[PDB]
Design a protein around this ligand. Structure first.
Ligand SMILES: COc1ccc2c(O[C@@H]3C[C@@H](C(=O)N[C@@H](CC(F)F)C(=O)NS(=O)(=O)C4CC4)N(C(=O)[C@@H](NC(=O)OC(C)(C)C)C(C)(C)C)C3)cc(-c3ccccc3)nc2c1
Ligand SMILES: [Cl-]
Ligand SMILES: [Zn+2]
Length: 194
């Protein structure tokens, strides 16, 4: 037990992304135990933590999504107390918590662009060439440590719409050359499933 806690956020707003920390380790541990977090949710991407891992969560279609390998079946701390997951799919590595009515959320990409942008937990905005529904190649190889903690973050198109959620890196001898992600169409199938 213990809730996932929002510890920071990434603001995309104007041409350059920036990360903002909102909670330190002590406040995080306290918040995880109660599940009560009075902070209002802002920004396009949330930086979230459990007692052992930090990763990202992204709101799309009014649901805050993240990876199961980070969140497990945990609740998320909120102003109204711990929020139980609305969606849980171990096979897709996907978790979603319903966000409050009218909260800011990304909309799906329908433009078919293959020019994607991955937002990391350090607010780096990396170009990615789409290769299939759930894969994209990096334009520069990166050490795997550069992407650690970015699972749950968004892949965006040039119009700033959501293409998917970052899940895993294609890693060979510590070098990431491509990314594996959960496409927004798959999040929508999860939302439409009873
Ligand atoms: C359907 O496709 C998938 C694909 C991957 C899944 C998964 O991946 C695991 C988790 C993921 C990962 O480690 N994600 C990183 C980002 C990465 F760039 F480093 C992350 O931020 N999360 S974390 O674990 O560090 C935690 C937050 C701090 N993996 C990988 O990135 C691996 N690559 C990989 O698996 O590539 C394939 C898919 C091409 C084979 C390595 C570690 C070698 C780089 C292996 C883990 C799980 C999973 C689900 C539920 C419970 C437990 C595990 N399901 C997956 C389903
Ligand atoms: Cl679009
Ligand atoms: Zn688009």
């Amino acid at each position: 037990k213990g809730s996932v806690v929002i510890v920071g956020r990434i603001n995309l707003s104007g041409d350059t992304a920036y990360a903002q920390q909102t909670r330190g380790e002590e406040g995080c541990q306290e918040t995880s135990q109660t599940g009560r977090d009075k902070n209002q949710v802002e920004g396009e991407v949330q930086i979230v933590s459990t007692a052992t891992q930090t990763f990202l969560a992204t709101s799309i279609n009014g649901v805050l999504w993240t990876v199961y390998h980070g969140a497990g079946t945990r609740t998320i701390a909120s102003p109204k107390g711990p929020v139980t997951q609305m969606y849980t799919n171990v096979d897709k590595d996907l978790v979603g918590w319903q966000a409050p009515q009218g909260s800011r959320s990304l909309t799906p990409c329908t433009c078919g662009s293959s020019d994607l942008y991955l937002v990391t937990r350090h607010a780096d905005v990396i170009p990615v060439r789409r290769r299939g529904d759930s894969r994209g190649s990096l334009l520069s190889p990166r050490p795997i440590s550069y992407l650690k903690g970015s699972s749950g973050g968004p892949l965006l198109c040039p119009a700033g719409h959501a293409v998917g959620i970052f899940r895993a890196a294609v890693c060979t001898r510590g070098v990431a050359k491509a990314v594996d992600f959960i496409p927004v169409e798959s999040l929508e199938t999860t939302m439409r499933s009873p």
